[PDB]
Amino acid sequence: DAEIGIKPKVIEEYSLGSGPSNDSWKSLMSSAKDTPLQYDHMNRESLKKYFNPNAQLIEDPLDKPIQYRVCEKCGKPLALTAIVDHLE
Amino acid sequence: AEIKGIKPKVIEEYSLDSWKSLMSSAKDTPLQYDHMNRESLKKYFNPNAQLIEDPLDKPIQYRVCEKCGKPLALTAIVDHLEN
Amino acid sequence: MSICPHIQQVFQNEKSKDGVLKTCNAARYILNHSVPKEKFLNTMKCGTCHEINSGATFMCLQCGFCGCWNHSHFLSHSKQIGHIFGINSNNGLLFCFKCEDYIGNIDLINDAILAKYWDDVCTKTMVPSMERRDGLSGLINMGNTCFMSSILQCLIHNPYFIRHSMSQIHSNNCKVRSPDKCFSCALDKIVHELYGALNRQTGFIYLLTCAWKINQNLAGYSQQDAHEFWQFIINQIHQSYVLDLPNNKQCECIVHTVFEGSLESSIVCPGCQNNSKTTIDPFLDLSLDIKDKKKLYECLDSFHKKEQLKDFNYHCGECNSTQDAIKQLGIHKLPSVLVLQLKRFEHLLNGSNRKLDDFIEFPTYLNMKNYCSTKVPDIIYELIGIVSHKGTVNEGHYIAFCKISGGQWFKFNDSMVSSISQEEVLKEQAYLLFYTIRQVN
Amino acid sequence: AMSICPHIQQVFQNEKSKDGVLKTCNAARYILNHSVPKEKFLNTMKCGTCHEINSGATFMCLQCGFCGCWNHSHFLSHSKQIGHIFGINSNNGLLFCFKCEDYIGNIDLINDAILAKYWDDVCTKTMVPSMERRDGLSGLINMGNTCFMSSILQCLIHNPYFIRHSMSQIHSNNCKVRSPDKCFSCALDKIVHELYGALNTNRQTGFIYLLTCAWKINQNQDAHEFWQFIINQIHQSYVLDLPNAKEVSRANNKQCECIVHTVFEGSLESSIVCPGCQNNSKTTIDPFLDLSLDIKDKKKLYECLDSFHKKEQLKDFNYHCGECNSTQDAIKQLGIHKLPSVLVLQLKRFEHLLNGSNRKLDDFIEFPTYLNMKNYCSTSENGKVPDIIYELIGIVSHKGTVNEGHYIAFCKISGGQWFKFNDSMVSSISQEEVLKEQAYLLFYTIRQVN
Amino acid sequence: EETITIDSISNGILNNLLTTLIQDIVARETTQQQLLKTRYPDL
Amino acid sequence: TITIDSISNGILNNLLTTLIQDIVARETTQQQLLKTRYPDL
Amino acid sequence: AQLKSQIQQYLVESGNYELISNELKARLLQEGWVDKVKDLTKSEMNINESTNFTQILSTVEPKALEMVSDSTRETVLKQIREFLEEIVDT
Amino acid sequence: AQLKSQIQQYLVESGNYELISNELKARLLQEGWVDKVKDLTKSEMNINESTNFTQILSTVEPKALEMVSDSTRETVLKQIREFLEEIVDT
Ligand SMILES: [Zn+2]
Ligand SMILES: [Zn+2]
Ligand SMILES: [Zn+2]
Ligand SMILES: [Zn+2]
Ligand SMILES: [Zn+2]
Ligand SMILES: [Zn+2]
Ligand SMILES: [Zn+2]
Ligand SMILES: [Zn+2]
Ligand SMILES: [Zn+2]
Ligand SMILES: [Zn+2]
Ligand SMILES: [Zn+2]
Ligand SMILES: [Zn+2]
Ligand SMILES: [Zn+2]
Ligand SMILES: [Zn+2]
Secondary structure, three states, X not given: OOOOOEOHXXXXXXXXXXXXXXXXXXXXXXXXXXXXXXXXXXXXXXXXXXXXXXXXXXXXXXXXXXXXXXXXXXXXXEEHHHHHHHHO | OEOXXXXXXXXXXXXXXXXXXXXXHHOOOOOOOXXXXXXXHHHHEOOOOOOOOOOOOOOOOEEEXXXXXXXXXXXXXXXXXHO | OOOOHHHHHHOOOHHHHHHXXXXXXXHHHHHHOOOHHHHHHHHOEOOOOOOEOOOOEEEEOOOOOEEEOOOOHHHHHHHOOOOOEEEEOOOOOEEEOOOOEEEOOOHHHHOHHHHHHHHHXXXXXXXXXXXXXXXXXXXXXXXXXXXXXXXXXXXXXXXXXXHHHHOOHHHHHOOOOOOOOOHHHHHHHHHHHHHOOOOOOOHHHHHHHHHHHHOHHHOOOOOOOHHHHHHHHHHHHHHHHHHHOOOXXXXXXXXXXXXXXXXEEEEEOOOOOOEEEEEEEEEOOEEEEOOOOOEHHHHHHHHOOEEEEEEEEEEOOOOOOEEEEEEEEEEEEEOOEEXXXXXXXXXXXXXXXXXXXXXXXXXXXXXXXXXXXXXXXXXXXXXXXXXXXXXXXXXXXXXXXXXXXXXXXXXXXXXXXXXXXXXXXXXXXXXEEXXXXXXXX | OOOOOHHXXXXXXXXXXXXXXXXXXXXXXXXXXXXXXXXXXXXHOEOOOOOOEOOOOEEEEOOOOOEEEOOOOHHHHHXXXXXXXXXXXXXXXXXXXXXXXXXXXXXXHHHOHHHHHHHHHHHHHEEOOOOOOOOOOOOOOOOOOOXXXXXXXXXXXXXXXXXXXXXXXXXXXXXXXXXXXXXXXXHHHHHHHHHHOOOOOOOOHHHHHHHHHHHHHOOOOOHHHHHHHHHHHHXXXXXXXXXXXXXXXXXXXXXXXXXXXXHOOEEEEEEEEOOOOOOOOOEEEEEEOOEEEOOOOOOEHHHHHHHHOOOOOEOOOOXXXXXXXXXXXXXXXXXXXXXXXXXXXXXXXXXXXXXXXXXXXXXXXXXXXXXXXXHHEOOOOOOOOOOEEEEEEEEEEEEOOOOOOEEEEEEEEOOOEEEEEEOOEEEEEOXXXXXXXXXXXXXXXXXXXX | OOOOEHHHHHXXXXXXXXXXXXXXXXXXXXXXXHHHHHHOOOO | OOOHHHHHHHHHHHXXXXXXXXXXXXXXXXXXXXXXXXXXX | OOOHHHHHHHHHHXXXXXXXXXXXXXXXXXXXXXXXXXXXXXXXXXXOXXXXXXXXXXXXXXXXHHHOOHHHHHHHHHHHHHHHHHHEOO | OOOHHHHHHHXXXXXXXXXXXXXXXXXXXXXXXXXXXXXXXXXHHHHOOOOOHHHXXXXXXXXXXXXXXXXXXXXXXHHHHHHHHOOEOO
């Protein structure tokens, strides 16, 4: 129904970035290092309000099958993060 | 048919008292059973056979340790206590 | 009953007590060690009449005389000389001829071979119990398993648990290192069997043996409850974390970082809405009354509700005014995996057990936002497992269902595994429901 | 068979190039997991070319920092304009090949790139999940129903020879393990203690420790098999706590003084005669701890015993007699040479057939309360066999089919009272009624021998 | 007593064995009951 | 040329197509891993 | 007269007293007699509130003699008959 | 044109893009849509004997857009328009 420019007051409150296209994603490495674990559809401040603070969280756990490998000597199922210790 | 007496010729097998004077031979007889004949046992049973004559005649005779709670056979009782 | 006074008498003199015992044994020994012919001729031949087996034949206790019964010849011998005690040579039993009866109820006489040690025996051992004397007792059947097994399937298909097991924590820490001794090592074995390679599912059996030894109520057909086993099992995992630690509170173990929530009960000022008192109660599952309900969210509702208290008139600091405090319950803290029990069992103190049959509608995605305290975004859990009971309370079995990765449901009916649609899994009358946190806005 | 991106394989022939791809894969996944929503939307879901957010998936270039959309094909253009053909979906970390027009989802080292530094070990010392176990789908094997043990155990603990033996503390006196969960006989002894003695709270610990000891010893239906199992364990434990190595053999090969062997063992005489000439070679004397009787077409136990001690025929071809050269069929008879103090008869009721098939014979067989065995013993001259009479003290019965199927014990106690033991239910029962049961095991104790 | 025929002593010897036997059987049942009844007042 | 209704639909379309393309990528890759890892199924 | 004891002596001393005795017990056992006499004794203790031997025996011995089956009596008496033809004379 | 991105930059930085986006995933999940799309994908993989993303996408994507409910569509659009009208001029 309507037609549309963008409100001049709101432009001044943010808009023209942009930085170079070829550095875009690499650019985040530095602050990612300072940033704690984030989930796509688990909001950080709601996890803090409504869940225990040392709660375990696997996002979308049934999305893909379990990621494991089986030891050749003992035949144990090992989580990827446990394999290297198991082996030494 | 009325009994006229013993055949004299039978009193020819013959040749001849307090119960307490049986301990002489008793102490040297091995365990006998009232109605399991020792020759048939020797013959049709094994030489090491265990036997309990009339085993359902009366209940198992035993006593129970005050401390253990273990049920003890009468001939077992004193060794349990002693050591 | 009473005892032979004549023998009781003689037993007051303790040299003549040892006398009749010595004689009882001597006799019996002879009886047990005499050839039939010598037995017949010297223990069954009557002294007065000279007949063998004129009935019972009795060896006198005082002389060497032997008397038959049928011609009252031991009765005569006891008349005078006066010797009133005889041992029947068929059986060793002691007869009193004034009592006209057998002395059968004197333990010392029955058990004469322990004569020498009798006082240590009287005081350090007792006669058998009335109800144990014949060894009668039932022995229970241990094929009652499905209340333990359906739970295990839920745990074996729960992703927080698999991650824990397959990450080797317990195995790196356990001091016992044996599936027959340690409960946790038994679970690791089940995981090793189901998911890994061998080097027969003994995992469940080891786990049973561990279980029944730790708590024998877990055995037999005593109608045990799948829920009780849930609590039992998660408790064991916690107990194992606490034992492997070197040396108010909130625990870092798997059970306590995955399944624990907390309820909040508080007194709120109906004026300024600030909470005046707040008590917080941890939980590992929630139990939901289902009488007359028809949908899971109607059960959760009655759970989190406001109550006008009629006996709490108080002063609000914040207001500041006099208020009749409202009470409200609501979740303070949600678990990573939420476990719900629909209450279907009344095991009454009036013995008989009833199961509620009611179908309750449950969703594949469950939004817990309304049941939370203090404006609350969507908190959505994904249904990953169900434990169900069918049919009758005492002849029934528990069945587990589990969503695996990619969305297939399976039905576990020990030990038949089978595929199953979701449209059907939803038709079950759920007893336990397992939900795992999927979306938090 | 399913194929792998040739371009990415092409890149991985080179070692450095390979390592570099995996560093970039970890870094992009790292960033996606350590980035606040607003910084995720602006720097990994914003097309470098059209500046839109979420014009479909946005891909993070594997070789520069460019991000490009799918819907207007801006990564495709990027790939064509500068030859950078690989990118990562910023919603999921999945690597895409814009020449294959598809994702590289089937390479373990890329999927599992967090282990890049140790791949040599990982892929040599661990294997992928087998297809059958990958989802953990398996039924759980319980112990089975346990009445085939219950029911034998009730008979054993109402057996006067065994009770006497248990109550004499002989095992207790000699055992070296001295605990129920580890030693089987200790567990048997505990059952006795709970049943006859005292506590100092269900009388069930013995039984549970025993079930457990049984399965530890033997990983795994048949009451009779469990009878044989128990008795071997009892013998095995006499041999174990014996002073020697010379005595282990004499006891295990010639003569044993264990409770089992001195109460349940008899000897069969198997005579093979020539029917022409009468050559009695060869005849053997073999022990037995029970007798298994056939019951097809029989209505009475004496008929069963008769059949078992009847003269057969051996058709074993390529045979001729020693002394007389007759190829004629050899006569075999079975006969009792030594009787046991306790005779355990088994009525063969379970035919195991081929494949998985089976059959239960439900035939009623009359059994007497007093059984006389004179007619079934071997030696014109008066060595005519005297009465040798046993008394029935225990029956085990089976109801149902062979597969599923329930067991019940009957036991006579002192004073000649019978009890029916149906797992936990113990009830009294008349002789009349016990004598109507379908016996499977009969337990006879020696009563009179003339 | 009765005139000592061959059928007379024969009956007398059988009689002796039966009665001795009956009395043995009765002795063992009375003594057992008497021990149980005094040992366990409330059977 | 360009309405509120219209550019509202562009934004929704972007969100949907993004979400669809993510679901599909996880499914296709997943099945592709199963077929490579296990020839028979 | 009064030699009946002396017959008994020779029976025992020859071994036939045993034969007789045992053939009887074996027959009585197998006939179920032994058990009926035990159960009868229980019936009598119970209906007479008593465990007095002499008194119960009064009530039991006569019914227990009546019970012995006629084949056991005949057979066993026939056996005794014969061992006397051996040592007693016409 | 080329102010679509300008307005999307706004939403992202005001936090209302998170909101729109999250409310949408939230609706779609609860109405079963995510699951329907996953299954549609698996079915097209079967029907076409392929796991190639581009090919499968092309048959799934139009049917997945046809599949969102009226409610979700009307409600979310409404919500978007609302946040728009606070920052544009007509
Ligand atoms: Zn290993
Ligand atoms: Zn003790
Ligand atoms: Zn005297
Ligand atoms: Zn006399
Ligand atoms: Zn007296
Ligand atoms: Zn452990
Ligand atoms: Zn804990
Ligand atoms: Zn207030
Ligand atoms: Zn673009
Ligand atoms: Zn590039
Ligand atoms: Zn390629
Ligand atoms: Zn032991
Ligand atoms: Zn042995
Ligand atoms: Zn020949």
